[PDB]
């Protein structure tokens, strides 16, 4: 009841292959070249133990920076000033070219793909979600505009108490393959999204992962491409990246748009570089100049009532899948749980990538330390 989705390969039936059919023809021609999409898989290294610290450059102004990175469970840290890498850090056991899960920084990448299609005139943010995904009729996404999804200004009954298996947040993970399925669970991410309800009100920010996955669904219906491919075509393939990114997929092959991307720190910085270059990447324009300007400008401040954000950034806001600090520097950031940031410092034409593994997903304690680092590093880049 979720309508047409992009086939896993040319001519594939809906939902095919599954874990139980991938060895059968015609699936197997595709599956034998893509088995990691069906079965958990490990890299077998072609290459035959200590932290790498090349902090520059900023080490003089921040002598204790490495210790501060250790204290916030930093896995990869990179500062791009202009086009130049001016500081790098990677923990022992994590190589410079290793990939790291982005969690909700993935959302900012999804918003970028939507922006690309807006630039092409294939998505109108003023249109209702149901213009593109009619099958969301009868759900909380029946009524709201695409822009309201982009800005996450839709009231949704979405329990964030993860430990409760009944919670929407854990059910979302189970539907998408991030957690073991329970009997009665939705078959895939699309079905889960259709189960969501709300009181109908809009206009106030509510951070909710479902919004990003609806955006990816819209992308698929508009382009006919799997979100996996759209993310490449409209963003990743234009970055001149060192490595492919990866994205977890659910049982239909739908990329887990809201949280499932992994990539290298250096490559993630290329996304920030594109944003600070007015939307243009090495391989071509990604989003319009206007789109970038709107991101840097922020969303409606009055919509933003998340004290977990405004306690630190009183004039903060959220728009188009980016957090906007509204601080004196105009900092904007992608953010994901356990300490992921794609942090933009337009003042110094710099991007800071910090990819981490805090023991906890989201506490005031970790955010205080992490934001202190990002701000101190940003200021260290100012001319003096």
Swiss-Prot record:
Coiled coil: none annotated. Involved in nylon oligomer degradation. It comes from Paenarthrobacter ureafaciens. This is 6-aminohexanoate-dimer hydrolase. It catalyses: [N-(6-aminohexanoyl)](n) + H2O = [N-(6-aminohexanoyl)](n-1) + 6-aminohexanoate; N-(6-aminohexanoyl)-6-aminohexanoate + H2O = 2 6-aminohexanoate. SUPFAM superfamilies: beta-lactamase/transpeptidase-like (SSF56601). Keywords: Hydrolase, Nylon degradation, Plasmid. The active site is at residue 104. It comes from the Bacteria. GO terms for biological process: nylon catabolic process. One of its GO terms (molecular function) is 6-aminohexanoate-dimer hydrolase activity. It is an enzyme of class 3 (hydrolase). Pathway: Xenobiotic degradation; nylon-6 oligomer degradation. Pfam families: Beta-lactamase. Its EC number is 3.5.1.46. The EII enzyme is 100 times more active toward the substrate than the EII' enzyme.
